[model samples]
Target: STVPRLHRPSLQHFREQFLVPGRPVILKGVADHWPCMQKWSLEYIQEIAGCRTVPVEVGWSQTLMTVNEFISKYIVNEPRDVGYLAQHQLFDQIPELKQDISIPDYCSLGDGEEEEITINAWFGPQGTISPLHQDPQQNFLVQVMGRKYIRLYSPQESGALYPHDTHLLHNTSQVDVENPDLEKFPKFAKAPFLSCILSPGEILFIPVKYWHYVRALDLSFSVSFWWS
Candidate 1:
């Protein structure tokens, strides 16, 4: 799809619009230039990660699901006998990923332990949606296959966030994306928002602390990199 690339010279513009402004930017170039994009796909990933243990989280319990079972039920939906591993194990399972991508020293842990990166491949069918939430670290979301619809709100709209007291967000106002609930989350009704549809070979830069909600328009594959 020939995604747009952002070079060092463009970083200043990106920093001003997205980083400094605490907003999101739809970057079309980075992934388009990557050689890996030509071969990345669910079938390919399954081949590489096949039968290998990976992590899956159930609800918000933080409980670890065994890889086999998680893949069977969640990924392939076989039965309860199979198990899944912790979601964090994906990086370990996909050696090619670690080899092809470089982790900056600043992003690595200095404790001598192998530095870990949080990278996720999200596969979703139609009707799938992620609730609005704030990410603590900067996020580089890459769309390798399919399409997704994203809606973003600035951090300044915290008043409309309806954040929960327990540090987890819940009962987010069901303000219709087209028609918001002014009476409930009155502040959000008037909040400014940016919307974009991410297609294959595209990447979206979501700055830290911004609020975002994502939904799959069809079967989609998205990889998200979260780091400092």
Candidate 2:
């Protein structure tokens, strides 16, 4: 299915309908406005930062960990340190990005209001996959370089997600995307799912509280914007 673009004039209506309703939509035109879109490509990114080391963080913990550790625990079926880029220095290197996009202010539940924008570049080889998980903040995922397959589950299917008791934002679904144990997570079989293939110059809007699992079809570069 073709995902529609949400233009600036229609952003409020789009937010009211799709964002408020907690549905995922892909905006096909937004990336063209980004300065990075004009200069970024597999060749360009590789030329500037192909062999550089990057920090990979594990689930829920902001602390930096090695790519091997993150792969062993979080990423499933992917080899460790295969050019996955999450380095903080990339921002400094690509100084043009400072004027490319505007980061919005986010509301806080506690004393001081602070918003965090978690940016990461996923350079996945042919078949890298992430375990199913839900994020607390609204997600604006922009694919800058390559292709990826994203599978999303609706919020109404919360029970099927088999959420962990200890972590409020995570689910108990194992990382086995190829062979799901129906006997263990039978509810997942009946859960509603939406699948989309994100390509270069496309942005996927994932509402807060939705479960998403992503697989890279090729070496991909994506930036995620999050706000509370």
Candidate 3:
């Protein structure tokens, strides 16, 4: 009802529609060639990360846990602590899994070489949440497994997003994008936003400096490529 969908649009068309306007869109078939579309499953990830301990985030603290252990909690529906393996450079840590996907050609448009592109992997159970925040670089969020609902606010509406006062979270919004406390941050009520449920095999483009909030609807895994 919010974000628009484009089916196999040419790169030029994508640039014209979203890139130029600093808007977001759901793009299908853009990742059809990535093996992760087929190979990424709970079992497959558990296998690949066998004996490897990855950092699982609960609030701001990290707990080291085996990938298999993370899957166990993922199946439990509501977990005590929402431990998530998020924003990790899986391609660097689990290099074997790097063979499953390729960087999209559009990232080459960045000023630096492909080595400058930042790749991050996210894996978590349903109910995992990312607070309202903004990335400094443009993002291509690729959904490889399960689903997530995303809400995004344009950079132009920064004042309405209520950026934090502290240095650590200066880039983060104080209002909860899902259940905003209108009395506390009344201006957030006027924030212009768009949201969509990102499904498997889909991609969402987020412009640099855009505010975004995310919640996983199921056991989910995503790979994001960031570049200027």
Candidate 4:
């Protein structure tokens, strides 16, 4: 199945139609005004923050490295092991880059008079994978560079998705969405899912606790806004 796609929906309509009911949608033409849509190339990012150190992850463990060092070693040329700069509060760390993008107005629909929004960055070469997982807050994922294939399952499918038993990966699933090992995870085969090939300038709305998996189709840069 495919997630519904909308174009520039109003905040009231979006909240009433999608948010209240907990459904995912792809919003196009919603982030065209962000400077990063045009300015955030690999070269531009390196130029702006190359010397700054950022946390990078491989095999679920993290290490810190300068952006230039990461680009030269892993992104510039493919390596056997994957290195992803994922789920980091990069805007807080490098506010200069924060000037390039703005938060989506839809965040105002969040449940409190003073709810806070958390923003994170995901940057990696093609083939980077985030195994199926769920988040505690609503997500607005903006694609700035390249494309990504995403698969989503509703919260009701948690059991079929088979979440991890360990505390560290408790939110993550054991089944690989693209290639299922039916013998070990037979229930996964029956799980229904919605997918999208998110491209630059697109924003994907993922409801709180919805299961999702992501794979970069190219050297990709994406920003995610999370709110209650």
User: In TM-score terms, which candidate is top?
Assistant: 4
Top lDDT hit = 4
- For candidate 1, the TM-score is 0.71
Off by over 4 Å in 3: 74-78
Whole-model Cα lDDT per candidate? 0.59, 0.62, 0.85, 0.91
Question: What TM-score number comes out for model 2?
Answer: 0.72
lDDT tens digits by residue: candidate 1, 114-157: 34447766754444467677777777787766788888776777
Q: Choose 2 or 3, whichever is better by TM-score.
A: 3
What's model 4's overall lDDT?
A: 0.91
lDDT (Cα, 0-100) at 58 in candidate 3: 81
Per-model TM values vs. the true structure:
0.71, 0.72, 0.93, 0.95
Which portions of model 4 show Cα errors greater than 4 Å? Answer: 112-115
Write one digit per residue (lDDT tens) for candidate 4, span 77-103.
Answer: 657678999998888889899999887
Worst 10 residues of 4 by lDDT: 108-117
Ranking by lDDT: 4, 3, 2, 1
Which residue runs does candidate 2 get wrong by more than 4 Å?
A: 1-9, 50-52, 56-83, 86-115, 168-172
